[PDB]
Design an enzyme around this catalytic site. Structure first.
Site, PDB file in Angstrom:
ATOM      1  N   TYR A 194       0.912  -1.417  -0.063  1.00 17.83           N
ATOM      2  CA  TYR A 194       0.104  -0.180   0.062  1.00 17.83           C
ATOM      3  C   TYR A 194       0.829   1.275  -0.103  1.00 17.83           C
ATOM      4  O   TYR A 194       1.901   1.356   0.656  1.00 17.83           O
ATOM      5  CB  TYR A 194      -0.858   0.051   1.260  1.00 17.83           C
ATOM      6  CG  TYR A 194      -1.990  -1.164   1.161  1.00 17.83           C
ATOM      7  CD1 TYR A 194      -3.099  -1.148   0.505  1.00 17.83           C
ATOM      8  CD2 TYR A 194      -1.686  -2.252   1.976  1.00 17.83           C
ATOM      9  CE1 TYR A 194      -3.751  -2.113   0.273  1.00 17.83           C
ATOM     10  CE2 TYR A 194      -2.683  -3.251   2.154  1.00 17.83           C
ATOM     11  CZ  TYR A 194      -3.697  -3.042   1.230  1.00 17.83           C
ATOM     12  OH  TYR A 194      -4.653  -4.210   1.382  1.00 17.83           O
TER      13      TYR A 194
ATOM     14  N   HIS B  27      -1.758   1.071  -3.423  1.00 18.84           N
ATOM     15  CA  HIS B  27      -1.525   0.578  -4.872  1.00 18.84           C
ATOM     16  C   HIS B  27      -2.870   1.003  -5.453  1.00 18.84           C
ATOM     17  O   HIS B  27      -3.894   1.427  -4.981  1.00 18.84           O
ATOM     18  CB  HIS B  27      -1.343  -1.039  -4.671  1.00 18.84           C
ATOM     19  CG  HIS B  27      -2.323  -1.619  -4.144  1.00 18.84           C
ATOM     20  ND1 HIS B  27      -1.929  -2.549  -3.143  1.00 18.84           N
ATOM     21  CD2 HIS B  27      -3.559  -1.824  -4.275  1.00 18.84           C
ATOM     22  CE1 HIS B  27      -3.168  -3.281  -2.558  1.00 18.84           C
ATOM     23  NE2 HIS B  27      -4.137  -2.749  -3.502  1.00 18.84           N
TER      24      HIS B  27
ATOM     25  N   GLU C  55      -5.336   3.027  -3.464  1.00 22.80           N
ATOM     26  CA  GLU C  55      -6.375   2.742  -2.257  1.00 22.80           C
ATOM     27  C   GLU C  55      -5.211   2.689  -0.993  1.00 22.80           C
ATOM     28  O   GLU C  55      -4.051   2.294  -1.132  1.00 22.80           O
ATOM     29  CB  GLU C  55      -6.954   1.517  -2.170  1.00 22.80           C
ATOM     30  CG  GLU C  55      -6.363   0.094  -2.268  1.00 22.80           C
ATOM     31  CD  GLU C  55      -6.915  -1.091  -2.348  1.00 22.80           C
ATOM     32  OE1 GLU C  55      -7.280  -1.552  -0.964  1.00 22.80           O
ATOM     33  OE2 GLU C  55      -7.585  -1.581  -3.383  1.00 22.80           O
TER      34      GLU C  55
ATOM     35  N   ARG D 296     -10.917   1.598   3.748  1.00 20.05           N
ATOM     36  CA  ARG D 296      -9.865   2.233   2.687  1.00 20.05           C
ATOM     37  C   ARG D 296     -10.114   3.639   2.349  1.00 20.05           C
ATOM     38  O   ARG D 296     -11.335   3.779   2.319  1.00 20.05           O
ATOM     39  CB  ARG D 296      -9.379   1.482   1.543  1.00 20.05           C
ATOM     40  CG  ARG D 296      -9.382   0.018   1.660  1.00 20.05           C
ATOM     41  CD  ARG D 296      -7.972  -0.467   1.918  1.00 20.05           C
ATOM     42  NE  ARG D 296      -7.614  -1.945   1.802  1.00 20.05           N
ATOM     43  CZ  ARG D 296      -7.997  -2.829   3.036  1.00 20.05           C
ATOM     44  NH1 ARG D 296      -8.416  -2.124   4.100  1.00 20.05           N
ATOM     45  NH2 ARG D 296      -7.816  -3.930   2.784  1.00 20.05           N
TER      46      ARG D 296
ATOM     47  N   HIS E  51     -14.635  -3.271   3.250  1.00 22.11           N
ATOM     48  CA  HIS E  51     -15.271  -4.619   2.776  1.00 22.11           C
ATOM     49  C   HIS E  51     -16.290  -5.255   3.602  1.00 22.11           C
ATOM     50  O   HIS E  51     -16.884  -6.178   3.441  1.00 22.11           O
ATOM     51  CB  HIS E  51     -14.027  -5.526   3.038  1.00 22.11           C
ATOM     52  CG  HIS E  51     -12.746  -5.715   2.107  1.00 22.11           C
ATOM     53  ND1 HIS E  51     -13.124  -5.834   0.616  1.00 22.11           N
ATOM     54  CD2 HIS E  51     -11.513  -5.243   2.146  1.00 22.11           C
ATOM     55  CE1 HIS E  51     -11.967  -5.770  -0.028  1.00 22.11           C
ATOM     56  NE2 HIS E  51     -10.990  -5.442   0.945  1.00 22.11           N
TER      57      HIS E  51
ATOM     58  N   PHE F 259     -16.159  -4.401  -2.305  1.00 22.85           N
ATOM     59  CA  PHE F 259     -16.023  -3.152  -1.548  1.00 22.85           C
ATOM     60  C   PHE F 259     -17.742  -2.498  -1.490  1.00 22.85           C
ATOM     61  O   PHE F 259     -18.222  -2.762  -2.658  1.00 22.85           O
ATOM     62  CB  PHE F 259     -15.210  -2.046  -1.918  1.00 22.85           C
ATOM     63  CG  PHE F 259     -13.400  -2.378  -1.544  1.00 22.85           C
ATOM     64  CD1 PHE F 259     -13.228  -2.120  -0.361  1.00 22.85           C
ATOM     65  CD2 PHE F 259     -12.943  -2.684  -2.541  1.00 22.85           C
ATOM     66  CE1 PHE F 259     -12.100  -2.495   0.008  1.00 22.85           C
ATOM     67  CE2 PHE F 259     -11.397  -3.209  -2.319  1.00 22.85           C
ATOM     68  CZ  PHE F 259     -11.134  -2.682  -1.116  1.00 22.85           C
TER      69      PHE F 259
HETATM   70  N1  3GP Z   1     -12.624  -5.469  -5.015  1.00 22.46           N
HETATM   71  C1  3GP Z   1     -11.663  -4.658  -5.670  1.00 22.46           C
HETATM   72  N2  3GP Z   1     -10.444  -4.858  -5.414  1.00 22.46           N
HETATM   73  C2  3GP Z   1      -9.374  -4.276  -6.015  1.00 22.46           C
HETATM   74  C3  3GP Z   1      -9.790  -3.216  -7.101  1.00 22.46           C
HETATM   75  N3  3GP Z   1      -8.603  -2.846  -7.467  1.00 22.46           N
HETATM   76  C4  3GP Z   1      -7.597  -3.579  -7.003  1.00 22.46           C
HETATM   77  N4  3GP Z   1      -8.033  -4.469  -6.064  1.00 22.46           N
HETATM   78  C5  3GP Z   1      -7.242  -5.349  -5.348  1.00 22.46           C
HETATM   79  O1  3GP Z   1      -7.763  -6.603  -5.345  1.00 22.46           O
HETATM   80  C6  3GP Z   1      -7.635  -7.266  -3.958  1.00 22.46           C
HETATM   81  C7  3GP Z   1      -9.245  -7.076  -3.408  1.00 22.46           C
HETATM   82  O2  3GP Z   1      -9.384  -7.171  -2.042  1.00 22.46           O
HETATM   83  C8  3GP Z   1      -6.773  -6.225  -3.085  1.00 22.46           C
HETATM   84  O3  3GP Z   1      -5.664  -6.315  -3.417  1.00 22.46           O
HETATM   85  P1  3GP Z   1      -4.519  -6.897  -2.155  1.00 22.46           P
HETATM   86  O4  3GP Z   1      -5.118  -8.004  -1.299  1.00 22.46           O
HETATM   87  O5  3GP Z   1      -3.081  -6.936  -2.707  1.00 22.46           O
HETATM   88  O6  3GP Z   1      -4.656  -5.533  -0.836  1.00 22.46           O
HETATM   89  C9  3GP Z   1      -7.408  -4.979  -3.665  1.00 22.46           C
HETATM   90  O7  3GP Z   1      -6.316  -4.196  -3.554  1.00 22.46           O
HETATM   91  C10 3GP Z   1     -11.068  -2.848  -7.261  1.00 22.46           C
HETATM   92  O8  3GP Z   1     -11.507  -2.254  -7.771  1.00 22.46           O
HETATM   93  N5  3GP Z   1     -12.046  -3.789  -6.474  1.00 22.46           N
END
Ligand code: 3GP
Ligand code: CA
Length: 104
Positions: free
Chosen positions: A38, A40, A58, A77, A92, A100
Site C-alpha cells: 500500500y 496501490h 487505495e 480504505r 469490505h 467493497f
Molecule cells: N474489490 C476490488 N479489489 C481491487 C480493486 N482494484 C484493486 N483491487 C485489489 O484486489 C484485492 C481485493 O481485495 C486487493 O489487493 P490486495 O489483497 O493486494 O490488497 C485490492 O487492492 C477494485 O476495484 N476492487
C-alpha cells in the site's frame, strides 16, 4: 456524528485527511508498506461514481486512529487520485468476498 461510517467504524474528516496524507506521500515517493503493498492502484471494478478523475489509489484507514504502517489493513480504505483529491471511503464490511461498498 460520523462523517463516514464503515460498518461499525466511525471516521471524521480529520481521520480521513490524516490517512490520505500519509498514503499520498508514499505514492509520491514511489514507496510501499505492508505485504500487500500500500498504496496501490484501485481499479474501481465496483463501478462507484466518484466525482474526481482516475487513476485511483487505495490506502488503509484504521479504526485505532493510527496511520497504517504494516500488518493487517483491516476492512476500510481511503481512495485518492493523482492530485491528492479524495475520491471516497470504502469498506469490505457488508460486501461479499473481497468486494467493497461505500461507507455512508
Ligand atoms: N474489490 C476490488 N479489489 C481491487 C480493486 N482494484 C484493486 N483491487 C485489489 O484486489 C484485492 C481485493 O481485495 C486487493 O489487493 P490486495 O489483497 O493486494 O490488497 C485490492 O487492492 C477494485 O476495484 N476492487
Ligand atoms: Ca477518529
Amino acid at each position: 456524528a460520523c462523517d463516514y461510517t464503515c460498518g461499525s467504524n466511525c471516521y471524521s474528516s480529520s481521520d480521513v485527511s490524516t490517512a490520505q496524507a500519509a498514503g499520498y506521500k508514499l505514492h509520491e515517493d514511489g514507496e510501499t508498506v505492508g505485504s500487500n503493498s500500500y498504496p496501490h492502484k484501485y481499479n474501481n471494478y465496483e463501478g462507484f461514481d466518484f466525482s474526481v478523475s482516475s487513476p485511483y489509489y487505495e490506502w488503509p484507514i484504521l479504526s485505532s486512529g493510527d496511520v497504517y504502517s504494516g500488518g493487517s489493513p483491516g476492512a476500510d480504505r481511503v481512495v485518492f487520485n493523482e492530485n491528492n483529491q479524495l475520491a471516497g471511503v470504502i469498506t469490505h464490511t457488508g460486501a461479499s468476498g473481497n468486494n467493497f461498498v461505500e461507507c455512508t
